[PDB]
Swiss-Prot record:
Residues annotated as signal peptide: none
UniProt protein name: Remorin
Domain of life of the source: Eukaryota
Assigned protein family: Belongs to the remorin family.
Biological role stated in the UniProt entry: Binds to both simple and complex galacturonides. May be involved in cell-to-cell signaling and molecular transport.
Whole-protein residues included: 160 to 198 of 198
Entry PTM: The N-terminus is blocked. Phosphorylated.
Natural source organism: Solanum tuberosum (Potato)
Location relative to the cell: Cell membrane
Length: 39
């Protein structure tokens, strides 16, 4: 389960990334919604 927490520190990081894309995509100016020049 300690490994779990490490895995979810990566999933967490990826969700943190996804929330980061949420932080970008909340700005609809980021029209592509894909791997773009800001990711």
């Amino acid at each position: 389960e300690e490994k779990r927490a490490m895995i979810e520190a990566k999933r967490g990081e990826d969700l943190l990334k996804a929330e980061e894309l949420a932080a970008k995509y909340r700005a609809t100016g980021t029209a592509p919604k894909k791997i773009l020049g800001i990711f």
